[PDB]
Amino acid sequence: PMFIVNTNVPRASVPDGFLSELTQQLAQATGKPPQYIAVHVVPDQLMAFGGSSEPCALCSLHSIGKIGGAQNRSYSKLLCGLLAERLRISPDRVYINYYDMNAANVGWNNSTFA
Amino acid sequence: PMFIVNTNVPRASVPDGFLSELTQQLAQATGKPPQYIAVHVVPDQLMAFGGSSEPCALCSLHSIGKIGGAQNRSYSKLLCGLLAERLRISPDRVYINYYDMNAANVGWNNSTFA
Amino acid sequence: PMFIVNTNVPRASVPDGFLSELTQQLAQATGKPPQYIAVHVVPDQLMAFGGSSEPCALCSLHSIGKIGGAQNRSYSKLLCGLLAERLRISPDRVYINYYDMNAANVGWNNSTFA
Numbered sequence: 001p002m003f004i005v006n007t008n009v010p011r012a013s014v015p016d017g018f019l020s021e022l023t024q025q026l027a028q029a030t031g032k033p034p035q036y037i038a039v040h041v042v043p044d045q046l047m048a049f050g051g052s053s054e055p056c057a058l059c060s061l062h063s064i065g066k067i068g069g070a071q072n073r074s075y076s077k078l079l080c081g082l083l084a085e086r087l088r089i090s091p092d093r094v095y096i097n098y099y100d101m102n103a104a105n106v107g108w109n110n111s112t113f114a
Numbered sequence: 115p116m117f118i119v120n121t122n123v124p125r126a127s128v129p130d131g132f133l134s135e136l137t138q139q140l141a142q143a144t145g146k147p148p149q150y151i152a153v154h155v156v157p158d159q160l161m162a163f164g165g166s167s168e169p170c171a172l173c174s175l176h177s178i179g180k181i182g183g184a185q186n187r188s189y190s191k192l193l194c195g196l197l198a199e200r201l202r203i204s205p206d207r208v209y210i211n212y213y214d215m216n217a218a219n220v221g222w223n224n225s226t227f228a
Numbered sequence: 229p230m231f232i233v234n235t236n237v238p239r240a241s242v243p244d245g246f247l248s249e250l251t252q253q254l255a256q257a258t259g260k261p262p263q264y265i266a267v268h269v270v271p272d273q274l275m276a277f278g279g280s281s282e283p284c285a286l287c288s289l290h291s292i293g294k295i296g297g298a299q300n301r302s303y304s305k306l307l308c309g310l311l312a313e314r315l316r317i318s319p320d321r322v323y324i325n326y327y328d329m330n331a332a333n334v335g336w337n338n339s340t341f342a
């Protein structure tokens with residue numbers, strides 16, 4: 001799994017330990033080992049949501065399985081709550097795109113997971 | 115819908131009001147209310163198109179529905195036109211990836227749109 | 229084809245000519261003319277892989293066709309090799325997402341490739 005956060009919140013407001021907290025929480029939520037989880041945080045972005053430049057985030061979660069109707073609602077609760085608590089972003093100004101990847105379409109370590 | 119523009123144009127060449135103009139134009143084009151539309155502009159990028167570093171842009175438009183053959187041609191004319199007029203990027207150095215998303219795969223406000 | 233590299237390696241560690249090298253290697257690997265190939269390198273990113281901030285990369289290769297089980301392994305060897313050689317990133321700290329794009333969902337030059 002890989003999780004990306006793009007946000008207009010400034011770098012200075014991203015707290016220490018945030019990438020590690022994301023890694024641990026995603027490990028718990030998805031059931032996958034933390035050593036496979038990649039997290040990417042992109043602050044200071046030029047963004048608008050609903051025409052407004054108040055804090056917002058556009059996120060993606062890519063996963064080989066563990067993606068689906070019920071699971072995606074659980075991920076959204078978990079991730080919106082983390083973003084609200086740590087970055088002070090309102091949950092109704094966050095979009096998270098969920099992608100269920102075929103293992104043959106993820107390259108790693110000079111091969112793919114096929 | 116969410117629209118993202120990556121470009122090597124510098125931030126200073128991104129005109130004031132560009133994010134609002136994109137929000138308005140995408141609302142018109144998709145028929146969705148502007149309160150739903152998210153826009154992300156990323157300037158100053160290290161990019162090449164066809165092996166050259168002249169202005170170029172790599173964009174994505176994600177939408178729940180309203181994606182398809184003829185619609186995508188219409189969006190391309192609209193968006194290439196804006197990028198040409200506002201950022202001085204030639205339409206043959208723009209790629210726009212179109213993604214039709216399932217409502218169950220878009221999180222927002224602690225749940226999904228499903 | 230479009231190829232994106234996101235990495236926490238610093239901007240100064242990216243060799244001049246890296247974009248041109250990527251363009252030629254991808255043209256050879258996919259069999260597509262280099263005029264069509266777009267490359268985007270994003271250094272200095274706030275990233276973690278497996279909970280650790282050592283150099284890593286998250287990449288995407290989008291292509292209209294030429295995506296599949298065997299192809300994707302040969303791509304992964306080539307790209308992992310090049311990132312290891314040139315940016316000093318260990319190949320087990322790289323993810324490459326492969327996307328097969330329909331031509332009707334790729335806009336370019338005021339239209340689509342359909």
Ligand SMILES: *[C@@H](C(=O)C(=O)O)c1ccc(O)cc1
Nearest residue numbers: 001002036062063064101323
């Ligand atoms: C993480 C991973 O290894 C898994 O098994 O889910 C991952 C998932 C999806 C993509 O595209 C890259 C890494």
Ligand SMILES: *[C@@H](C(=O)C(=O)O)c1ccc(O)cc1
Nearest residue numbers: 095115116150176177178215
């Ligand atoms: C915008 C939106 O909510 C709609 O009605 O389509 C949107 C579409 C798709 C994605 O992935 C995020 C936001």
Ligand SMILES: *[C@@H](C(=O)C(=O)O)c1ccc(O)cc1
Nearest residue numbers: 209229230264290291292329
């Ligand atoms: C490159 C291209 O034009 C091809 O022939 O595949 C390309 C492929 C896919 C996307 O999304 C953008 C550009």
